[PDB]
Amino acid sequence: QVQLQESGGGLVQAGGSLRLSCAASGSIFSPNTMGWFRQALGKQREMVAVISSIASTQYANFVKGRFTITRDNTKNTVHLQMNSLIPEDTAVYYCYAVDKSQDYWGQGTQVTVSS
Amino acid sequence: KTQSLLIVNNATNVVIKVCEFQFCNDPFLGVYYHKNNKSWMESEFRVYSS
Structure with missing residues (x-):
């Protein structure tokens, strides 16, 4: 039972900053790919960002240059540093453990920005 | 980062x-x-270290 632990969201005024975290534990076989995905009520899973074991970073055009992902090889965990918040980012996020076989999914983190 | 296979032969x-x-640089x-x-x-x- 590979489990992804999500933390670090909540209510923040426009212009604030937060740091989400997904820790993937269990099997999580070697060449893993970790992603972050967006969903606002009424829309679909919007692919926020993607990282492989190569350390390469892939981001979408929606929030250009505002999300950053940080890697922890020792614990093999991931952190989203989200800086310069805008109410179009008000959507719950999930992390995508590609693994190599049975892709997993998160429980979710509410991220809310408004004024 | 990737799985590895180890074969060794001790006296027994x-x-x-x-x-x-x-693996270190010189196993x-x-x-x-x-x-x-x-x-x-x-x-x-x-x-190997771990």
Whole structure:
């Protein structure tokens, strides 16, 4: 039972900053790919960002240059540093453990920005 | 970062494992006789950190 632990969201005024975290534990076989995905009520899973074991970073055009992902090889965990918040980012996020076989999914983190 | 296969042969048997070894730059076996017998040969595994 590979489990992804999500933390670090909540209510923040426009212009604030937060740091989400997904820790993937269990099997999580070697060449893993970790992603972050967006969903606002009424829309679909919007692919926020993607990282492989190569350390390469892939981001979408929606929030250009505002999300950053940080890697922890020792614990093999991931952190989203989200800086310069805008109410179009008000959507719950999930992390995508590609693994190599049975892709997993998160429980979710509410991220809310408004004024 | 990737799975690895390890095969070693000590004085008694073979050890074959498939795990996530953190191999160092120079894996090796520290090898020493005993003080009285010298018939078998004791080995210290310096192959992988974890």
